[PDB]
Design a protein around this ligand. Structure first.
Ligand SMILES: [K+]
Ligand SMILES: [K+]
Ligand SMILES: [K+]
Ligand SMILES: [K+]
Ligand SMILES: [K+]
Ligand SMILES: [K+]
Ligand SMILES: [Mg+2]
Ligand SMILES: [Mg+2]
Ligand SMILES: [Mg+2]
Ligand SMILES: [Mg+2]
Ligand SMILES: [Mg+2]
Ligand SMILES: [Mg+2]
Ligand SMILES: [Mg+2]
Ligand SMILES: [Mg+2]
Ligand SMILES: [Mg+2]
Ligand SMILES: [Mg+2]
Ligand SMILES: [Mg+2]
Ligand SMILES: [Mg+2]
Ligand SMILES: [Mg+2]
Ligand SMILES: [Mg+2]
Ligand SMILES: [Mg+2]
Ligand SMILES: [Mg+2]
Ligand SMILES: [Mg+2]
Ligand SMILES: [Mg+2]
Ligand SMILES: [Mg+2]
Ligand SMILES: [Mg+2]
Ligand SMILES: [Mg+2]
Ligand SMILES: [Zn+2]
Ligand SMILES: [Zn+2]
Lengths: 215, 98, 95, 132, 25, 200, 91
RNA sequence: UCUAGUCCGACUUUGUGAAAUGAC
RNA sequence: GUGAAAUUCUUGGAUUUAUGAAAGACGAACAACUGCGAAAGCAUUUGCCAAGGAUGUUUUCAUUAAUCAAGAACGAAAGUUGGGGGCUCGAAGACGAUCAGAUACCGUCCUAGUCUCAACCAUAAACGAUGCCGACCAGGGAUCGGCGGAUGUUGCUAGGACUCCGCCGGCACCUUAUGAGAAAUCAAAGUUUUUGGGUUCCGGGGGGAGUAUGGUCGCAAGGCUGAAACUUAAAGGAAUUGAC
């Protein structure tokens, strides 16, 4: 009975990703004191990057999408952070190696305040004989310092749309690995998580920039 | 009578080690003394892999694994048969079994 | 800090400790560097700087109150400001 | 408004404790419950609420209700009690997941979402633990 | 008797003597 | 009669050729000869008076206005202060925590002095003497000493009378009791030693 | 010589008011009657005029402080808290 | 057997709109 | 929630799901027969402040040293006084079970406490049950810090990472008896009737007893110091065979 008065809506992803048919979501039909659009606004959808990018190699990454506007039957969402799956992180953390983590708060050109989390692990050499590949605490601090510096530069210059485009190929991770190789070889350098602390007030003009005419 | 050279734990050149809580009963035990086992297994049991795979909604998909690190106290490890009482000669063998 | 360099002057150079003598050295142009404590009276601090600017004498702000400055000079009394007449050993150069 | 062949993905939150089993189906946002059946609703004794048989019956009811709403695909988010308590899923996790696969529902991406503290608050029972 | 509890018993017994002796000073 | 010290401040009158004298509740750290800045654009420093709109969250303030322009009603006693909790730009209001621990909504235009009231820790020192209490209340009002009702006769107090000193009925009285009957614990939600979450 | 073993300044109360109250009041009795360092002139010449008011004998600076001490513990915390907030806003 | 006060409802002060819902 | 149950919560919407916020605590995985510290103890990032071992040294002083009555600093947890804080957990208390009884173990709620500041307390299986300094006396690999030498690779900026040889210092481990020991066992617990490098503390069958008393320290809780009368032929250590 209660489900007989619910209208299904389609979820649309930004133009950054390939597949825009994220899925479907329902909500109670519009009624006095309860507008349907209000109920759907700011709803957070968690969908794997593999579905958005149609690539199974990205199954380890999850994308947070929040609804911004409801144009007709389509719900327009936007990037709202990303994080690893539980299995992915647990697979990277192994004994007999050093774990290095870093975080930084940066502001993009679109007034978006982000908190990027980086992660890396020490890498053995092909001819290495000792079982461990630990790094000295001084080396860890040097590596962590370069992680923060690189993350600031990549985010302080580009906008949110361009910054997200760097996460899909993990361009930032490769740059961090290249820069820190002179200190200690690293493996599995990723941007583990991204948080949206403060977002600029809604602007329909900018929302439609990354969304096409779904009519 | 002293039963073990290590005193039943693994502590050298340090005074105090913070304890952990037994995964079974919650008993406090020093981390260096607790019996630790890292269990990695498929999130889907082998008896259900065939059914789940047939119902998969994707052409290709790898079932994620379940990583769980178990820390037991001495009493729970013995009772659960994680470890067994060994003869005086076999107590010194530190290499994991086959 | 400049305590190590200042200590050399106290045993090899020429100096005057106190507000009244510092003005005297600036008037006669015998002062080459003026050091002022951070808790010096604001009006007194401005007057000394104006005198030093008029006489083309460098002014350095000591990192501490009048108590610390006197101790660094090897003395048992507070010093709000002082003037260096003879650098002694590489005191005015690196300042 | 779904054409033949298209998959309408839902999210099934499976909470497999050692005292009861929950099979909660929601939307992708998790803010719209579709059906919620617990193992305690299918048995008479408190001891059988977490049994695999109870989990199987709950899964069958959930699968039937999902078809009525047009839901044919489910994302699996399994979890244990978590927190400072046991991290091991209960005995009803495997039975519930297998039952859904054998009811026409197409299983999507499976994930473990047990709440894992990065430290934690003190566990109950005292420093000597639960003594049996 | 466990030594810890025997120690506890003696400490209790010393309070009574301490209080029973200070009763007359 | 006031524990907190007071500060005399001189201002230049905005449009009259004369000095403007003021008397502020002294904030901890204030000193003679200090410059005090009041206004929307005054910097965040102890002693300055700013509107709540310009004070960031977590700041310690005192003498907070309840109504814009009422000149300060909140957190005026020695050692007391208010904490800015959050701002609401839509409603133009601010949340502050009062000394009693209550949260209140006030318009963002309300002014407040940065810092806490000076003279804190006064009540920690024991009086030790009736005379010290006498001198304290000699300059406040005629409220000391206090005679217990159970020591009076029935004619002048509900607790009076009886061959033993005792109340004889529940000391908790309802809110609507008329004057002369409303004595003791007025509208007490509970009684007894405050143990557990009650004393939070 | 040592006139009192432990009573110190609270010896003026004789045998009255109980030991705990005398011990409790000793802390504030000593602090409110002691000289404090003057940040302005650099002398130990700050004494309490009245509760919460502290004036320097030498330079004449009058400062609003604690009831029985020049600087209360919360006073230091407030200054650091205000300073931290100012830097963020003035960034 | 009553009463000041106090709490509570209606009318009055008391006008201008809108929406939802309901009645005639 | 439990072996099973019950106390307990619930259509006044419990449990469950998503988002957001506050509060207080904690700092998982990495994490090791690894590190630092006089010990207690120390594990999220970055900055500041002082301190420190080892290594390197063709620098300097030139016996300034070792161990220590008295006397001092620090000293887990619990506890004590007051203020703050009060999530979680939780003595006492209450209740639900179990039971012949159950003031317990299990379950539910919960006070002090658990966190912090100021001031005390000075005790732990505070254990390596092994005081500190010095010399000598087997072998072997691994590991941590520093340095020397050799060598050719790195999606790297001489150096780092890795490989090989060696030196000093550290936490340990493995084999072995030519040793020691009542043995367990120990590369020190060896160099001891073939007895002696230096120095401090400390023990003299088992109980009574860390009790009484006096002194001293502490707000208290107690700490430190510390007997006798009397009682007893064993108590105890290591190992062996049985029985359980
Ligand atoms: K062990
Ligand atoms: K009176
Ligand atoms: K009275
Ligand atoms: K009476
Ligand atoms: K001490
Ligand atoms: K070595
Ligand atoms: Mg290295
Ligand atoms: Mg034994
Ligand atoms: Mg060490
Ligand atoms: Mg210890
Ligand atoms: Mg058992
Ligand atoms: Mg009174
Ligand atoms: Mg009378
Ligand atoms: Mg009467
Ligand atoms: Mg003077
Ligand atoms: Mg950590
Ligand atoms: Mg380490
Ligand atoms: Mg001694
Ligand atoms: Mg302590
Ligand atoms: Mg002892
Ligand atoms: Mg000992
Ligand atoms: Mg010694
Ligand atoms: Mg020792
Ligand atoms: Mg090395
Ligand atoms: Mg051996
Ligand atoms: Mg001998
Ligand atoms: Mg004896
Ligand atoms: Zn256990
Ligand atoms: Zn002064």
């Amino acid at each position: 009975d209660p489900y007989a008065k619910k209208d299904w809506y389609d979820i649309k992803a930004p133009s950054v990703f390939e597949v825009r048919n994220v899925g479907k979501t329902l909500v109670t039909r519009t009624q006095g004191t309860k507008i349907a659009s209000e109920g759907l606004k700011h709803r957070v959808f968690e969908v794997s990057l593999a579905d958005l990018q149609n690539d199974e190699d990205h199954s380890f990454r999850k994308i947070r999408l929040r609804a911004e506007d409801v144009q007709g039957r389509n719900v327009l969402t936007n990037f709202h952070g990303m994080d690893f799956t539980t299995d992915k992180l647990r697979s990277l953390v192994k004994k007999w190696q050093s774990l290095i983590e870093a975080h930084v708060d940066v502001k993009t050109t679109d007034s978006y305040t982000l908190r990027m989390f980086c992660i890396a692990f020490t890498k053995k050499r092909p001819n290495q004989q000792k079982r461990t590949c630990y790094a000295q605490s001084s080396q860890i601090r040097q590596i962590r310092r370069k992680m923060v510096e690189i993350m600031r530069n990549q985010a302080q210059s580009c906008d949110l749309k361009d910054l997200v485009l760097k996460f899909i190929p993990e361009s930032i991770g490769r740059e961090i690995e290249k820069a820190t190789s002179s200190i200690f070889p690293l493996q599995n350098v990723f941007i583990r998580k991204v948080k949206i602390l403060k977002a600029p007030k809604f602007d329909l003009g900018r929302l439609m920039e990354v969304h096409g005419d779904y009519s | 009578t002293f039963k073990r050279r290590n005193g039943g734990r693994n502590k050298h050149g340090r005074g105090h080690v913070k304890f952990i809580r037994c995964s079974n009963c919650g008993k406090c035990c020093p981390k260096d003394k607790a019996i630790k086992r890292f269990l990695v297994r498929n999130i889907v049991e082998q008896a259900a892999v065939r059914d789940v795979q047939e119902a998969c909604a994707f052409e290709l998909y790898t079932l994620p694994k379940l990583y769980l690190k178990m820390q037991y106290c001495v009493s729970c490890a013995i009772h659960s048969k994680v470890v067994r009482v060994r003869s005086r000669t076999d107590r010194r063998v530190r290499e994991p079994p086959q | 800090s400049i305590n190590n360099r200042l200590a050399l002057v106290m045993k090899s150079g020429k100096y005057t400790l106190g507000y009244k003598t510092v003005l005297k050295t600036i008037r006669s142009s015998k002062g080459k560097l003026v050091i002022i404590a951070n808790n010096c009276p604001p009006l007194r601090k401005s007057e000394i700087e104006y005198y030093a600017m008029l006489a083309k004498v460098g002014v350095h702000h000591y990192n501490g109150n009048n108590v610390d400055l006197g101790t660094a000079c090897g003395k048992y009394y507070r010093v709000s400001c002082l003037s260096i007449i003879d650098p002694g050993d590489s005191d005015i150069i690196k300042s | 408004s779904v054409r033949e062949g298209e998959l309408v993905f839902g999210v099934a939150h499976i909470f497999a404790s050692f005292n009861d089993t929950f099979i909660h189906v929601t939307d992708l946002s998790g803010r719209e419950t579709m059906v919620r059946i617990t193992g305690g609703m299918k048995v008479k004794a408190d001891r059988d609420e977490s049994s695999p048989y109870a989990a199987m019956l709950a899964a069958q009811d959930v699968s039937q209700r999902c078809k009525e709403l047009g839901i044919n695909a489910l994302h699996i988010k399994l979890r244990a009690t978590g927190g400072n308590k046991t991290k091991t899923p209960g005995p009803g996790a495997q039975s519930a997941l297998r039952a859904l696969a054998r009811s026409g529902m197409k299983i999507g991406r499976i994930e473990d979402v047990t709440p894992i503290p990065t430290x934690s608050t003190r566990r109950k029972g005292g420093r000597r633990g639960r003594r049996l | 008797m466990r030594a810890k509890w025997k120690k506890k018993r003696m400490r209790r017994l010393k309070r009574k003597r301490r209080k029973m002796r200070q009763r007359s000073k | 009669g006031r524990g907190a010290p007071l500060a005399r401040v001189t201002f230049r009158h905005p449009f009259r050729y004369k000095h403007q004298k003021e008397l502020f509740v002294a904030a901890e750290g204030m000193y003679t000869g200090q410059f005090v800045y009041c206004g929307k654009k005054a910097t965040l420093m102890v002693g300055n008076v700013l509107p709540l709109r310009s004070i960031p969250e977590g700041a310690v303030v005192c003498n907070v206005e309840h109504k814009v322009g009422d000149r300060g009603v909140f957190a005026r006693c020695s050692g007391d202060y208010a904490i800015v909790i959050s701002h609401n730009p839509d409603n133009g209001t601010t949340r502050v925590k009062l000394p009693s621990g209550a949260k209140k909504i006030v318009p963002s235009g309300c002014r407040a002095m940065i810092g806490q009231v000076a003279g804190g820790g006064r009540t920690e020192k024991p009086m030790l003497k009736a005379g010290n209490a006498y001198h304290k209340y000699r300059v406040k009002r005629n409220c000391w000493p206090k005679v217990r009702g159970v020591a009076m006769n029935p004619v002048e107090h509900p607790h009076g009378g009886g061959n033993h000193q005792h109340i004889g009925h529940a000391s908790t009285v309802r809110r609507d009791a008329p004057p002369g009957q409303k004595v003791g614990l007025i509208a007490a939600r509970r009684t007894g030693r405050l143990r557990g979450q009650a004393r939070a | 010589t040592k006139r009192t073993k432990k009573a110190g300044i609270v010896g003026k109360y004789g045998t009255r008011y109980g030991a705990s109250l005398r011990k409790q009041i000793k802390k504030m009795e000593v602090s409110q009657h002691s000289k404090y360092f003057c940040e302005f002139c650099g002398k130990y010449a700050v004494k309490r005029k009245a509760v919460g008011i502290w004036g320097c004998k030498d330079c004449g600076k009058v400062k609003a402080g604690g009831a029985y001490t020049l600087n209360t513990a919360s006073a230091v915390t407030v200054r650091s808290t205000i300073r931290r907030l100012r830097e963020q806003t003035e960034s």
